[PDB]
Symmetry: C2
Subunit: 405 residues, 2 copies
């Protein structure tokens, strides 16, 4: 019961033009567009009920404070967290991982320990860890890759030992579209007493996610890629763990009491990790996005997308010299290169045709180096994308071939 | 050439009602309301030209990337920074101070050094420093206060020695309304080779600020209090200093190259300190706010406000048992208490009258303890506030007196 027509109707940005031609936005993987329900949801808040949160004595203040917490609660349901107090608000996935890397990392990883990451990880789930290791004096281990864009799981036994503190894996790759066997991996990581942090910035909007079912200890995703506003993300941490974690950022709202002579005492999670004035407007907008996606049902969306993907792939076969990267059972994104032509030019011609695509390393250099490629193209397929747009890509891609030879 | 009528016309939130009566929003100090120019400025961006920044190959992407940087540039002019590359985007003042406390603090303050802060500092310019001292092993020194809400400057000579690394002062208090002699203080702090970080979250919207004229090494303010959107602030750092500072948060966009075997190299300031996807929408909105305030001219606003303040003060004399806190030459806020009645109740009755005011410690406990008061009231006067609203406060305040006796 899904209708691309009814959906695309909510995104005003889609009826725009570029270079005089209709815009074919195939870069939702970099950041998704927002429906007018999400846009107005925030705007209205600013126009009719804006006030400082932090539970104030006056009305608007107390009302805003409540709306904010309802969003936290609603989001806990979305990923199916056990309780709303297991969710911390962050700017995005990047900040989320940095919070963990510091708060939890600095106090659980001693010199001599090792952390495991995959080779397909986005820079946000790499650098924060390299830094932790730099100062704590720990070892960083990487799960190699197979040619088809899948993790070489057979190497797991020789990476997971007694001194393995944490496993930071991506739920779904942002380039290959690969979806990793989280469940299984988490189990194995737990049998060694290691914690697991899943980076689901790419998973949250392609199908349902149950943090309880997975039993991951940390989960993060960004709102701007979930058809929502920028500057707001969600960090989920198991209550058991969160309570033990020390504050990262310090300031107002996250303290219980501040004394220049007695010292300062912190408040309790999650508020302990939310210092200063919130991104109230972004949160309100995130709620709108959450509610909107639920209205269509992740399963219905998951279906229309998987269908449009099969179409897209088969169609891309008629393009000569096209080289794809990743598994056949890919999700959301398509990584490719045209013959020996620099991705920068292929994307440049495509833009001229009114088609949006990303070209570069996609903040995933280690993965580019695995393929000896300096960069590739990445077309993204989202719920608001149509078959016609797929053809438009295929065609212009063949055109670029016949032209540049 | 200022007209409260023309101005209040731009803020839709002001024509709202609370408890059936017209809203008299006197809490702009906690967070200011936004004019429809700022609200739509962001909304339009989301509707017509939204895309991921980070300079992409496609059009919308490259356009958004440019708009973002124009805002950075425009903001550099607003505080009169020497160059736009001296401004880093942050969530707000709180995050800004935390960035400095970490990036600069961890590498310039050795055990045995001391940092000086005032006793009127907001918790955001206290806790971050207490933490630095905790781990680095440095001493924290406080500039005492005078009964009239002013710094006891005579104590400066005995606080500033050879081992004084930094001075973190507030440009204008958020409770007392005091404006400190920054210029002079900065000079003296520099003669000892100490750096100065000014917290102008309360100054930026009451009158012009020239970071060059002051010669401060760090300056921070939050956009949500400058009639702008939430989740976006500005951290100014002297180019000379910024270039030397090491990254705090790690992830994409802030790297030059990432190699799992070669290590990772950073990009250059300010982008080095801006990891992950920006708050593009908040930035766009910040630009709108910046441009709007400039249209009215900080000097014109500074005048209408200082005038409304003198009115307010004289009028508050007719209120029996009223106790004010702070200097006569106060700026923007009014801290007070009614007889022996808890601020919570005074504010509660005022809310019932359709008047918004803050009650509590205002994230400034050390200051409350100086007055042996557990909390006080704080009415804020902004450009959109009128004389009538002042009377409404005075009257209801006398009413609360005659009622609770």
């Amino acid at each position: 019961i899904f209708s691309v027509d009814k959906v695309r109707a909510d995104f005003p940005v889609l009826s725009r033009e570029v270079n005089g031609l209709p815009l074919a936005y195939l870069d939702s993987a970099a950041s998704a567009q927002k429906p007018s329900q999400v846009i107005d949801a925030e705007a209205e808040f600013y126009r009719h009920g804006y006030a400082a949160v932090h539970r104030g004595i006056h009305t608007l203040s107390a009302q805003a404070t409540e709306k904010m917490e309802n969003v936290r609660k609603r989001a806990s349901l979305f990923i199916n967290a056990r309780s709303a107090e297991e969710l911390v608000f962050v700017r995005g996935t990047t900040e989320g991982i940095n919070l963990v890397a510091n708060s939890w990392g600095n106090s659980n990883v001693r010199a001599g320990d090792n952390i495991i990451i995959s080779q397909m990880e986005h820079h946000a789930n790499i650098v924060p860890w390299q830094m932790l290791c730099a100062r704590v004096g720990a070892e960083l281990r990487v799960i190699p890759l197979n040619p088809d864009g899948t993790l070489q799981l057979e190497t797991l036994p020789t990476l997971f030992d007694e001194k393995t503190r944490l496993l930071a894996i991506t739920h779904v790759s942002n380039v290959l579209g690969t979806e990793n066997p989280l469940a299984e991996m988490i189990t194995l990581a737990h049998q060694h007493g290691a914690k697991v942090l899943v980076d689901g910035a790419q998973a949250v909007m392609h199908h349902p996610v149950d943090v309880q079912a997975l039993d991951c200890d940390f989960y993060v995703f960004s709102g701007h890629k979930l058809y929502g506003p920028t500057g707001i993300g969600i960090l989920y941490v198991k209550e058991a763990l969160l309570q033990e974690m020390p504050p990262w950022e310090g300031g107002g709202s996250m303290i219980a009491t501040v004394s220049l002579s007695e010292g300062t005492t912190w408040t309790k999670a999650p508020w302990r990790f939310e210092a200063g004035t919130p991104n109230t407007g972004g949160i309100i907008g995130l709620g709108a996005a959450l509610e909107y996606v639920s209205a269509l049902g992740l399963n219905n969306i998951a279906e229309y997308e998987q269908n449009l993907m099969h179409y897209a792939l088969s169609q891309l076969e008629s393009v000569p010299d096209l080289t794809l990267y990743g598994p056949q059972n890919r999700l959301g994104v398509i990584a490719f290169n045209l013959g020996k032509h620099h991705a920068y030019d292929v994307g440049s011609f495509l833009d001229n045709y009114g088609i949006a695509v990303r070209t570069g390393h996609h903040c995933a250099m280690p993965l580019m180096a695995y393929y000896n490629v300096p960069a590739m193209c990445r077309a993204s397929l989202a719920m608001y994308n149509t078959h016609e747009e797929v053809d438009r890509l295929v065609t212009g891609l063949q055109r670029i071939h016949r032209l540049l030879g």
